[PDB]
Nucleic acid binder design. Structure first.
Ligand SMILES: CCN1C[C@H](C)n2c(c(O)c3c(=O)n(Cc4ccc(F)c(Cl)c4)nc(N4CCN(C)S4(=O)=O)c32)C1=O
Ligand SMILES: CCN1C[C@H](C)n2c(c(O)c3c(=O)n(Cc4ccc(F)c(Cl)c4)nc(N4CCN(C)S4(=O)=O)c32)C1=O
Ligand SMILES: [Mg+2]
Ligand SMILES: [Mg+2]
Ligand SMILES: [Mg+2]
Ligand SMILES: [Mg+2]
Ligand SMILES: [Mg+2]
Ligand SMILES: [Mg+2]
Ligand SMILES: [N+]
Ligand SMILES: [N+]
Ligand SMILES: [Zn+2]
Ligand SMILES: [Zn+2]
Lengths: 184, 368, 368, 184
DNA sequence: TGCGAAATTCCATGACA
DNA sequence: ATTGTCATGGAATTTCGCA
DNA sequence: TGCGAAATTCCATGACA
DNA sequence: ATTGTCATGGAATTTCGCA
């Protein structure tokens, strides 16, 4: 069996609904399996249409051999299947109610959700603009398991934005009590 | 004047007037008998005015002006006086063409890493497609990897929206661009400073300096053209396809595609290279670092036989950028302050501003 | 196809497939073990479709297309199959640039007499002056003597009014012009036939052919520019002055002014040449005939190392004259009917019309 | 004394009034002394202004050392004198009532008047258009005294329009009786 | 029959939309 | 059925003045 | 250790307004 | 304060298959 590589498998999923930001409500999350590299796309809905429009952008840069998702409607539609077939992408689904990735991807998705929650509180509506910096953070975050960031593993170089200040990622007593009075 | 010419008539010798010819008076004018015939020797105090009259008939250069004067006159060293006047004719200096070529081009070192340097530019206007008219083209200097963004205008705000999408992947150290309005605005400077990106600008009106991106423009248009043959020019929906197609095309000299130089492995595109299937990613990234440093680099070509090269304090003229009809193609003479490299100089322009300028947009001022 | 490949698997030898390599079956496909790795050998009946897929990714030429195929496949003589497809890609043939230079220019014999050949052309639009916008420039081929006429439009009727004034002095045998609307109209043909003047037209979009007059245009504008520095562009009243100034300017290579070549004696202009004051007119006209035949004539320059020269029956492509945005720069291939001289040909254009065309507006169709 | 040359002397004079043609009434006649070459210019009046406008055209082609004329108003005005001075042209006048040229010029002027009269009768109003051909005729007319036409003497070559049919220049019995009923 | 400098010739460069 | 040209100013070469 | 032909490399040409 | 580039297809050169 051959070693794992970038573009071997992309793991996709939606996050939301969120508070509106420039009329966007969801984030399509894409994480490369081997490198842990993350791409994010704002959408207006978790539809096959929004998925296709978003992945069209990403796949104009690199095409995965396999896309893996849970059995979300958007990902199981025959339109999305056509789209993948046109591009020679094999689609992969986790069994219903039993989502599975790998340790790396699970951990990365955890960070993504946590990092979003942390920056939305205090400005729940400014998140659209923050997506670029969220991604740079995620991709320049050091991997405990491998000695390298996703950036390093994707490009074979150091980044020009080292995030040498690994953040708390937790909520301060300020952010906790004012997040409980945000949706209240 | 009449001083010199008197001594001459009475047979005495004067330096510059060969003694072997007979000088005489006739019609109240000092004449001499030359192989070509009899010419008038005007007094020195007349000569300037004569040269000027000859020159001004049609603002002729050295030989054509001389040939006129020689019809009637002779005196020692006529061309020195001719050349003296040419160097003082503002109209000739700013209108005539240069007849000296620039020195041979520089081939700057390829940036060492992806994301060290981005070259950017606009193409357009193109025929409207989906209400878009321009394309922002961003080219990584090391890899040649390219990003395409359709815009309604070659504007800062559209440049900023596009670069925000791009820089999501990675932030470059330097962005290089020509001096188009989109890139020279302070809004764009602020956007760049905010991200630690250094802006580096081409000398004005010298797209060779943005050569990396300019050359990719050609390929972009060439592929768009081929794809649109026999169809209406609906290019908007094609940009993604073109981007992908070009980033995965081999350069025969390099033997790599820009994608390969960027990631060290083909993605799931047709005819993907399989040579590193058995390497670990680590082994792969090690071979990639090696490939990146051993890439062919071109060298500076031989100079043309009549090239000129800039020297501090030399009088030079900047090319007028968008000259009007019947107006001079060259600015008034200026002075080389610093020689940044053999193809780039700083000049002081009579206003006087400091201007960093390409040698290709200069001529050396003639006749000193 | 499967025929050839079967014989190969069972160890037999086939021409083109080197015997020293081991050919095997795997995953239902004939493979081979090459120094570069293991490639699939597709059946011959598959190869065309493969080359096409490789080529179509970005409409790449020989090596870039080959490099894609070589990633997965091997078969004997792959480039022959690559080149076969390139020669059949309409989109590549009509969009790609040429990479072969034209053969070295001709230097046609200077017409023997004044009035043998006139070269004519329009300059403009210029800024309006007195309601005029264009200049008709008429240049005698032998002398370089020039006539200038201001016009409101580059029209037959204005050309006709001007030529009626000019031809009052003398009628030329031939008038040479490019294919502008003013000169190709039948009204102009009638005007010419009425006077026994033969019209001779440049190949289209090749102003080098009207070189004589084109070069004089430059001098005309250059002098106008100098004279208008610091003033508004009131050129109308200057045409006469420019005409006179240029007709009486020396050509350093010739050592004569065009007036001198025309009349053999200076009129009452500044610095008039006096050398023939003691000759009779007859003696003067005798020396003139002599000067006219001994004038310097330039010769054909050395060919560039990668020039091409036209051969009867060769496939060639005419340059598109005013190509639209994102549209091919070349017409579909055509056939050389006759080779008029090494720089001019007659082609049959697929419509099919006969067209007389400059080699500079042609490329040889690639890959045969 | 040096031999005679083209541009040594131009002989000028007006002819008219004539029947209107494109609103023109006069012809300014210019004949080079040495060659017998003739230039013709249509004018609206025999004024200094019309003379200057016309000669400006001719002198943008060749400038004479001397202009000779009779003492016509147009030629004796101080404006015309200024014009000549600017151009370094010396002006020459024949004494009043005693016009003098040379044999050649006298003969040429005779032909010009006669040739005009011949072509105006029958079409007294079409003469403006005929000026070009009148000049080619005059300039390609062989000189009894010298062996050469003015064209040959000015340019040193044969012309492409030889007028090998030397015309009658006289009036037919048609042209005589219908010229006497033209101004009648 | 030879020197130093002036004169002349050579010729790449660039522009005629 | 048509086809480059020629002013320009440093450099290269030749000629000139004198001996 | 050398042949004929295929493969690869070389590189002038031209276009990025 | 900055700086040409690189796909292209015939030709030139090198390598390959075989002996
Ligand atoms: C307004 C800021 N600008 C300045 C000018 C208009 N420019 C430009 C830009 O992108 C350009 C180009 O791509 N090309 C094409 C090109 C031509 C030759 C060449 F070698 C290469 Cl590499 C490219 N030409 C441009 N130029 C027109 C003529 N010159 C005035 S110019 O400057 O040379 C140009 C700008 O954005
Ligand atoms: C409509 C009939 N016409 C055809 C074209 C427009 N033309 C023209 C005319 O007088 C022209 C010129 O003077 N120059 C200037 C020029 C350029 C290079 C050169 F070497 C020389 Cl001797 C001169 N260019 C022209 N051209 C624009 C580009 N090409 C399309 S083009 O044909 O080469 C041109 C016409 O009258
Ligand atoms: Mg889900
Ligand atoms: Mg630009
Ligand atoms: Mg550009
Ligand atoms: Mg024209
Ligand atoms: Mg022209
Ligand atoms: Mg009178
Ligand atoms: N460099
Ligand atoms: N010829
Ligand atoms: Zn001048
Ligand atoms: Zn193609």
């Amino acid at each position: 069996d051959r070693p794992q590589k970038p573009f071997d498998k992309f793991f996709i999923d939606y996050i939301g609904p969120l508070p509106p930001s420039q009329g966007y409500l969801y984030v399509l999350v894409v994480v490369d399996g081997m490198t842990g590299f993350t791409w994010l796309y704002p959408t207006k809905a978790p539809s096959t249409s929004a998925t296709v429009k978003s992945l069209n952008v990403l796949t104009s840069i690199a095409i995965p051999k396999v896309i893996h998702s849970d059995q979300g409607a958007a990902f199981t539609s025959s339109t999305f299947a056509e789209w993948a077939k046109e591009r020679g992408i094999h689609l992969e689904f986790s069994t219903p109610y039993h989502p599975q990735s790998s340790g790396k991807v699970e951990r990365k998705n955890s960070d993504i959700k946590r990092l979003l929650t942390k920056l939305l509180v205090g400005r729940p509506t400014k998140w659209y603009d923050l997506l670029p910096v969220v991604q740079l953070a995620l991709n320049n975050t050091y991997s405990p398991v491998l000695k390298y960031t996703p950036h390093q593993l994707l490009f074979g170089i150091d980044s020009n934005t080292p995030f040498a200040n690994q953040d708390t990622l937790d909520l301060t007593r300020e952010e906790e009590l004012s997040l409980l009075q945000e949706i209240r | 004047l009449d001083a010199e010419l008197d001594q001459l008539l009475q047979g005495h010798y004067i330096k510059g007037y060969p003694k072997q010819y007979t000088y005489f008076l006739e019609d109240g004018k000092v004449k001499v008998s030359r192989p070509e015939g009899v010419k008038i020797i005007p007094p020195q105090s007349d000569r300037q005015k004569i040269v000027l009259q000859a020159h001004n008939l049609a603002h002729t250069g050295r030989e054509a002006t001389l040939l006129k004067i020689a019809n009637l006159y002779w005196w020692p060293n006529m061309r020195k006086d001719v050349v003296k006047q040419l160097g003082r004719c503002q109209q000739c200096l700013i209108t005539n063409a240069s007849n000296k070529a620039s020195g041979p081009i520089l081939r700057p070192d390829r940036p060492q890493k992806p994301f060290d340097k981005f070259f950017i530019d606009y193409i357009g206007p193109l025929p409207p497609s989906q209400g878009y008219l321009y394309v922002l083209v961003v080219v990584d200097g090391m890899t040649g990897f390219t990003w395409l963004y359709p815009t309604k205008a070659p504007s800062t705000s559209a440049t900023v929206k596009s670069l925000n999408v791009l820089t999501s992947i990675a932030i470059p150290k330097v962005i290089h661009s020509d001096q188009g309005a989109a890139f020279t605005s302070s809004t764009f400077a602020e956007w760049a400073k905010e991200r630690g990106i250094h802006l580096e600008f081409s000398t004005p009106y010298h797209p060779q300096s943005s050569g990396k991106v300019e050359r990719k423009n050609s390929d972009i248009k060439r592929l768009l053209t081929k794809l649109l043959v026999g169809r209406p020019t609906k290019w908007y929906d094609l940009l993604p396809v073109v981007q992908l197609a070009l980033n995965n095309t081999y350069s025969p000299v390099l033997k790599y595609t820009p994608h390969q130089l960027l990631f060290g492995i083909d993605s799931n595109t047709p005819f993907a290279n399989q040579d590193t299937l058995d390497l670990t990613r680590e082994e792969e990234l090690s071979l990639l670092q090696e490939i990146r440093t051993s890439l062919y680099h071109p060298s500076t070509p031989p100079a043309s036989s009549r090239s000129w090269s800039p020297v501090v304090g030399q009088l030079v003229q900047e090319r007028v950028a968008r000259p009007a009809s019947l107006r001079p193609r060259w600015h008034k003479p200026s002075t080389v302050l610093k020689v940044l490299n053999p193809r780039t100089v700083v000049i002081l322009d009579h206003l006087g501003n400091n201007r960093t300028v390409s040698i290709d947009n200069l001529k050396p001022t003639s006749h000193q």
